[PDB]
C-alpha cells in the first residue's frame, strides 16, 4: 500500500539499512549485467556458428 | 465460546465449510472435475509431438517409441501373451515358418 518505512535520501544512505543494502546490491547486479553483455556479445573474437543455416527455430515452429 | 473456525480441526472445518456454507459450489466443482477427467484427459502421440515437449520432440531418439515398447513388453511378459498366435499375425504358424525361411 506504500504507506511508510525507511527511505534513503540519496545513494550514500543506502548503507544505513540492511534491506536497502541488499536492494542496492541487486540494482548493481541488474545494471552491471548489461555492460557485461555488451562486452561479451560484441567481442571481436565472437564468431557465428558455421552450421547456423543447418537448422533454426523458424523452420521448427513453422 | 464455540466457533467452527477456532475450535474445530482443519478437516472438520473443511467439511462444514463445503457442506453447510458452500455446498452448491462444491457440487458444481465436482461436476466440472468429472467432466474434465471424462472429456479432457487424453493426448495422442501426434499431439504430444506437436505441443507436448518444451523445445520440441526429439525424433533422434523417439522416446514415445521406447515408452510404448516398454509398455508392450511388460504387458506381454506379465500376461503370458503368445504374439505368434494366428489372430495377431493373420496366418498359421507353419505359414510363418515358411515366410521366415523365404525371407
Amino acid at each position: 500500500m506504500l504507506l511508510g518505512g525507511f527511505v534513503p535520501r540519496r545513494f550514500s544512505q543506502f548503507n544505513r539499512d540492511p534491506c536497502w543494502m541488499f536492494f542496492i546490491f541487486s540494482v548493481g547486479f541488474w545494471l552491471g549485467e548489461y555492460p557485461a553483455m555488451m562486452i561479451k556479445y560484441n567481442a571481436r573474437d565472437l564468431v557465428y556458428d558455421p552450421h547456423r543455416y543447418v537448422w533454426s527455430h523458424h523452420d521448427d515452429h513453422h | 465460546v464455540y466457533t467452527r473456525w477456532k475450535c474445530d480441526r482443519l478437516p472438520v472445518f473443511q467439511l462444514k465449510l463445503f457442506t453447510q456454507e458452500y455446498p452448491m459450489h462444491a457440487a458444481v466443482g465436482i461436476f466440472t472435475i468429472i467432466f474434465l477427467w471424462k472429456h479432457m484427459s487424453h493426448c495422442s502421440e501426434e499431439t504430444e509431438r506437436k505441443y507436448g515437449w518444451w523445445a520440441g520432440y526429439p525424433y533422434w531418439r523417439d522416446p514415445i517409441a521406447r515408452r510404448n515398447e516398454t509398455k508392450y513388453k511388460q504387458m506381454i511378459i506379465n500376461n503370458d501373451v503368445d504374439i505368434t498366435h494366428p489372430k495377431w499375425t493373420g496366418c498359421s504358424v507353419e505359414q510363418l515358418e515358411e515366410l521366415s525361411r523365404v525371407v
Binding site: 511508510g4 | 522416446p63 516398454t70
Partner: protein, 139 residues
C-alpha cells in the same frame, strides 16, 4: 522503552475512518490507534495518511489488585481454546510449514529437473501405469 508492536491499525487513519468514534480522542485532537487512551498519538502523511502511536514510559495510578472472585469466570468448556493457546499452536504449525515450504522451494527451483528433456540427460520421459498383470484372458 522497548521496540514491541502495538494494537494493529491496518494502515488506516482513525480521524477519518468509518468507525472513528470508537477511537478515543486526546487533548491534541488526534484519535487513538486503539481503544485505549494514548497521549502521544500522531498522524503521518505519505501518499495516504496513517495514524501512529509511539510507546513511552508513563506512570499510571494502579488500582489495587481485586479478588479473584469478582473477575474470574469458570465457564470454560472442553471445546474452548484461549487466544494465547491458539497463538502458540499456530506459531508452531506455521514454523513447521515454513520449514517444509523452504525445503520444497529449494528442491523445486534448484534440484528438481524438468520432465521431457530434448537431450534426455535430465527428467523423465513418462511411462505407463495400471497395466494389467496376470490376466491372460484379457488378450
Amino acid at each position: 522503552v522497548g521496540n514491541g508492536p502495538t494494537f494493529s491499525t491496518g494502515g488506516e487513519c482513525m480521524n477519518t475512518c468509518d468507525i472513528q468514534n470508537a477511537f478515543p480522542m486526546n487533548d491534541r485532537g488526534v484519535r487513538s490507534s486503539s481503544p485505549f487512551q494514548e497521549p502521544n498519538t500522531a498522524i503521518y502523511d505519505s501518499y495516504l495518511a496513517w495514524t501512529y502511536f509511539q510507546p513511552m514510559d508513563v506512570h499510571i495510578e494502579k488500582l489495587p489488585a481485586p479478588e479473584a472472585k469478582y473477575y474470574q469466570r469458570h465457564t470454560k468448556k472442553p471445546w474452548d481454546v484461549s487466544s494465547t493457546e491458539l497463538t502458540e499452536i499456530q506459531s508452531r504449525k506455521k514454523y513447521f510449514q515454513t520449514l517444509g515450504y523452504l525445503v520444497a522451494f529449494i528442491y523445486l527451483y534448484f534440484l528438481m529437473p524438468k520432465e521431457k528433456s530434448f537431450s534426455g540427460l535430465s527428467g523423465p520421459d513418462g511411462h505407463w501405469i495400471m497395466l494389467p498383470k496376470g490376466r491372460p484372458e484379457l488378450f
